[PDB]
Amino acid sequence: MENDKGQLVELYVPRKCSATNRIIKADDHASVQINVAKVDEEGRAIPGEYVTYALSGYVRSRGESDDSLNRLAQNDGLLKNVWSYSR
Amino acid sequence: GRVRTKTVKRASKALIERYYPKLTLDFQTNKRLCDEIATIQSKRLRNKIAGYTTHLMKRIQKGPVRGISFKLQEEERERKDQYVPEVSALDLSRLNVDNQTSDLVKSLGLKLPLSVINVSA
Amino acid sequence: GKGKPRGLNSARKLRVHRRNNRWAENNYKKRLLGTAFKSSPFGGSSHAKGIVLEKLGIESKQPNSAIRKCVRVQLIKNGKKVTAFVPNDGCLNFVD
Amino acid sequence: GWVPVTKLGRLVKAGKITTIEEIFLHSLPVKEFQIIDTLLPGLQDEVMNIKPVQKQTRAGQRTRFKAVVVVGDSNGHVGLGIKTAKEVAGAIRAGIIIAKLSVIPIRRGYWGTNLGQPHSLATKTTGKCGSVTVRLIPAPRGSGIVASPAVKKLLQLAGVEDVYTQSNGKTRTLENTLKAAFVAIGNTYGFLTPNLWAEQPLPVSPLDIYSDEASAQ
Amino acid sequence: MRAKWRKKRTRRLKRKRRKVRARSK
Amino acid sequence: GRMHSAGKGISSSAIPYSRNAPAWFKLSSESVIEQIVKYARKGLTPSQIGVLLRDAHGVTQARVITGNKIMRILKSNGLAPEIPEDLYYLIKKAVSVRKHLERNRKDKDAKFRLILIESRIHRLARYYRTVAVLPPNWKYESATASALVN
Amino acid sequence: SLPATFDLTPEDAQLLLAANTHLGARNVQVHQEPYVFNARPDGVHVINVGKTWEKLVLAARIIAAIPNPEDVVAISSRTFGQRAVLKFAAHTGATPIAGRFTPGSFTNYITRSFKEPRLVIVTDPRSDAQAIKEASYVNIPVIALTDLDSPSEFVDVAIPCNNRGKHSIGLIWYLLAREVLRLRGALVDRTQPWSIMPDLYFYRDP
Amino acid sequence: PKKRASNGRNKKGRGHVKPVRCVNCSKSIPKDKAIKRMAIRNIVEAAAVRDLSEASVYPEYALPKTYNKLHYCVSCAIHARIVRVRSREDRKNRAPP
Amino acid sequence: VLVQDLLHPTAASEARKHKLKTLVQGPRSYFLDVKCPGCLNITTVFSHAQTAVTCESCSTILCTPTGGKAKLSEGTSFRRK
Amino acid sequence: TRSSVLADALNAINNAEKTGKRQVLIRPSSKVIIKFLQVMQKHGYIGEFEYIDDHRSGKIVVQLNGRLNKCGVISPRFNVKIGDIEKWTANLLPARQFGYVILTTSAGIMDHEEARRKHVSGKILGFVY
RNA sequence: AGGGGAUCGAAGAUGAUCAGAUACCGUCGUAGUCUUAACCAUAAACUAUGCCGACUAGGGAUCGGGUGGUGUUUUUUUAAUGACCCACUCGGCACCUUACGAGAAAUCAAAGUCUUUGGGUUCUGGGGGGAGUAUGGUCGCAAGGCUGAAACUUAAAGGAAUUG
């Protein structure tokens, strides 16, 4: 996206879906970003520490985003065992 | 047929949600306060507003009805909305599920007080 | 798929499909049958001289309504009578 | 003045959002044209066509006017708005509004070498509504906007310098031609290229962090 | 007309033309 | 599939991945080939030889037990027939239909089946002529086929 | 990471057994298939409450992530969960739409019932299907208390729970209200339960 | 255009079923395309059962019921109130009520 | 759900799916060691036995072919192999 | 019948990425499509793929990382010259910056950027971008 | 060409209706409807969707077959045994919902995997008429079928939906 002499020229870098690696469109009104909080001792979380996922409108239209959030939970440690890789 | 039109439905919505503390269930006195809470041009229309107003206030006193929200029900709802206990339900008072919930503890490195009882096959 | 021979040795079928379906245009058919040379009063020409035979009052097709003062002219280069139009306002005082 | 009604309007009027690039980053849904007005002060408008469509009634034909409006700065933003209103002034003044609400960015990229500022599109892109399939083709520099007299005005306000258009279908339908090129403008970001392959930290939305003052009650 | 009875007048015309042609030939 | 039919069936047999002999087998490659020979002296089709192997004995396949197939063994031992069993039964099927036709002339469906069987024979005979299993310039003469297939 | 205080103790498992949350619908859709243990001879499919609770942890961890509780939306349409939604609103901000959804509440800014959500939670996508499609225009995450036969289009966090026993939908709102309250604050440690029964959440006749 | 997905009939994988005749005008129609009504009714009329049981020599009667399978063409079924011209979204319904 | 492990599938799904559409294609059939009271020899009989079997020593019936796997006799013991 | 197993390979690959699937099953696993996918693997359009070796030519399972937006074939394998390579790249590929058209060549199966660099030509197998 | 020939029934006879009615309606009624031996080779012969192949989305029935159940039912109440139920599976006629997709739309799970345009292959079409006409060839006992124009004429014909 940059030109010959560095100095990156763009409008904005587009976001990508966490489930299918598809670029979030500007008009993608069905595409949503989910923030989930980070927890600490004695069942209390802290504000400002959030794990950010982006889900495309295509994946939500297919009805498959629930297990997509399950898979994005398993690959970093949001949920321990909710999505089976083998099925 | 003596059904009531949209103008006397809508204005009887408006002055009930705005003047319910100033409102009284008796028809002969809510008719006279309709003059001082609104500028109704004609006396017969004012009778139509006040008759539906005392009809709806008769319906409000037998439990609240949706579509009407005056000032008093807002703070009554806020009195319901400030319901907090000192402590709530799920606690460490005693996972009572199958071996998958043991894999919740075992696979990614946790230490949870399991009481594993499998489901019937 | 898509209804045509795609394979690498199928240039014969592509030739014969194109050369047989090219007989459904108007310009290719007029070029190959030579209809301008055979069935046309102009024998491959843009102009042809002729002689006035009669003046014919032709009523136009509706919604127009006009007598257009047409002229019937025998053409010289083959001998076919044609019906001809005279431009602008009349000119039947200018041709006899 | 103008009072906001949406939380995006509250953030724009308060100055928390400095540019529309954050809006297009998080795909924030615009509901007020004063958001685009006060955050793009240099936005120019153009009326492409006024098509009078009519409805057969018992009285005869009652006729409304359909206005297609192209807006956009040449810095890479363009919008299309179609409104059917009873009068030509109202159709223009409301077609401008929907064109403000439908402002989308365009991906200006490079044909060959990545020289200086971008001139053309970074990829070829398909847009199709109806039969009208407009194919935008990247062009070298100095090629010009090789387009229809309506699509060229759409691409001039989109800010691209040289581009080729291959428009098929019944492209005499002007509103379908402009909408198909509008779709082909929008899918330029949606096409994925290997220079964007790096994973990003996925920045938080301004609506999530500015919750302490927006829509204050 | 249908495409049936345009065809029927065609076929009766063709039958009449065939009989006339065989009469001349 | 289904060369002369509208069916889409996939009913077939998928032998296991093990190309070596199973552990439950007890006979050897020099002990089942005599059973191949004596069953062929009993005048049976190799399609029926493999059935009798798989059923009466534990002999699963000739390839998985021995180093050669059933018809490969018969050609090596000298009990190869004049024509292959695929062409034999197709001609036998055709003769059965042809015997049916002179007693049922108006059996037009069975008449149509004859062209289906005749086309299956002649494609298969064209294949055997290309790989020189049948002799060249061999014709299904359509009259004296019963000399070949009894 | 997860602290050790998130045990599914048998006291709340007894609550799930009393609420009949584990047994559900007669058929399972393909996006709810991993949430089913096995089948039963009488034909009633079962839902494992451990994965139900872990999805409820995730849903609570998204609700408590937003700093404002007033732009979180709870949706009910049928009478089977009106009181549970309102009692969920009775402890957090959590603005409710109980009854008619009146479409044009997430778009159509001139509506009096127009709202400005950052997250929606529905009782079920089958009965609240208009809220799901309207949230697909504003980029709103959807937390859905899905059944097995419930379609799961445009939803993101599916908690599999029963919607036939009366106490099941009330308890799945009650545990979710419990967990968002713990994760926000103003609650003491997890060594003792609520003073009264969860009967305050369930719908009663009349 | 195609008014119905199954064009007016119940015929997939046949090509030809049988012809049947209408019970009103005797029109040769296919059997699946025919509008079929199992006209099940008692022989006697309900305002005459009282007098028939009054005149009955039997203490208990079977009170019988005659049957017919009325096959209708589409012209006759619409004219004789058997079927109605429904809405475009209502054509897809197949329940008898 | 667009993510499956198509290299180690569950054996319940392997028993569910077709014998050809299995990831490693193979038979669902087996062989049986069948013992008759009228003979002392042991005979390996296919599950889909496909042909009536006589014993090597005596004339007896121990299977009856059908469309699928053959029906073993009532007064005959069998063991899987 | 299966007249081109490479075409039936890349069609199911295209159907997987249009669905957005992380994995797909491909039949019946020729070495042409193994070397085709090795060209895709060394450029990063797909993940590490597993070849299940049966005795019936087997099948493979391909991991897709979503970077591949269209993987088409050119059927049949047209005979291409050196000057015709840059004629075909302007038509098959969306931009001159990226995208590969894959040749079969006596030096091996490789993309057009490597074939232009080593100055040899062949028959077009397909294209990726 | 022969046998057969009950009903229905082209033609025809009439009797009504109607301004007319040699059409609808009524009663007859020939060929025909049936068969066998030959012809014809046409149908809105239509799923108006070539055939083969792969993949993509879910569901529930149903046909035929096959697998499994400490499932039910049948003289003996798990002992001599088919049907039914449930879970599947292959092949078929299909159907319902949603369309990511496609299309001009109706609609389509194929009409999808088509401007991000290439799985293989056959046939057909190039505005409407003239016209499936004339001529020629071939097949047929014939009726006719297959192939098949042009002159000339016209700025529309047509498809799907919307309102009146």
Tab-separated table of C-alpha atoms in Angstrom, chain C residues 15-69:
chain	number	residue	atom	x	y	z
C	15	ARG	CA	-14.725	-23.046	-37.213
C	16	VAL	CA	-17.854	-24.820	-38.437
C	17	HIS	CA	-20.033	-23.497	-35.595
C	18	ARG	CA	-18.956	-19.927	-36.319
C	19	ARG	CA	-19.194	-20.244	-40.107
C	20	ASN	CA	-22.722	-21.686	-39.864
C	21	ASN	CA	-24.021	-19.261	-37.223
C	22	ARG	CA	-22.619	-16.278	-39.142
C	23	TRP	CA	-25.405	-16.881	-41.685
C	24	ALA	CA	-27.900	-15.189	-39.342
C	25	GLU	CA	-26.656	-11.601	-39.466
C	26	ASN	CA	-27.980	-9.116	-42.000
C	27	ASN	CA	-24.697	-7.571	-43.170
C	28	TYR	CA	-22.837	-10.879	-43.607
C	29	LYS	CA	-25.797	-12.408	-45.445
C	30	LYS	CA	-26.158	-9.429	-47.796
C	31	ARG	CA	-22.393	-9.463	-48.418
C	32	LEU	CA	-22.176	-13.176	-49.212
C	33	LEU	CA	-25.399	-13.561	-51.210
C	34	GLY	CA	-24.680	-10.302	-53.049
C	35	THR	CA	-28.239	-9.001	-52.675
C	36	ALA	CA	-27.184	-5.414	-53.444
C	37	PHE	CA	-25.908	-6.514	-56.860
C	38	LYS	CA	-28.820	-8.878	-57.581
C	39	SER	CA	-31.987	-7.646	-55.846
C	40	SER	CA	-31.707	-3.836	-55.656
C	41	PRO	CA	-32.409	-1.118	-58.257
C	42	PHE	CA	-28.971	0.366	-57.450
C	43	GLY	CA	-26.344	-1.975	-58.871
C	44	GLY	CA	-23.723	-1.456	-56.177
C	45	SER	CA	-23.983	2.331	-56.374
C	46	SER	CA	-24.918	5.343	-54.281
C	47	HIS	CA	-26.435	7.282	-57.204
C	48	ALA	CA	-28.284	6.400	-60.406
C	49	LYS	CA	-29.807	8.637	-63.062
C	50	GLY	CA	-33.378	8.126	-64.235
C	51	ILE	CA	-36.326	9.676	-66.062
C	52	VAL	CA	-39.569	10.953	-64.510
C	53	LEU	CA	-42.600	8.908	-65.579
C	54	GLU	CA	-45.404	10.307	-63.396
C	55	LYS	CA	-46.083	12.395	-60.299
C	56	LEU	CA	-47.770	10.323	-57.589
C	57	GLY	CA	-49.642	11.763	-54.627
C	58	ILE	CA	-48.769	9.481	-51.710
C	59	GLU	CA	-50.706	9.812	-48.461
C	60	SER	CA	-48.451	9.259	-45.455
C	61	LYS	CA	-48.970	6.809	-42.609
C	62	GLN	CA	-50.938	7.974	-39.586
C	63	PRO	CA	-50.558	9.825	-37.153
C	64	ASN	CA	-49.052	11.975	-39.909
C	65	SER	CA	-51.332	13.245	-42.676
C	66	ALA	CA	-49.648	14.741	-45.739
C	67	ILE	CA	-49.552	14.328	-49.503
C	68	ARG	CA	-45.819	14.119	-50.101
C	69	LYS	CA	-45.831	14.662	-53.909
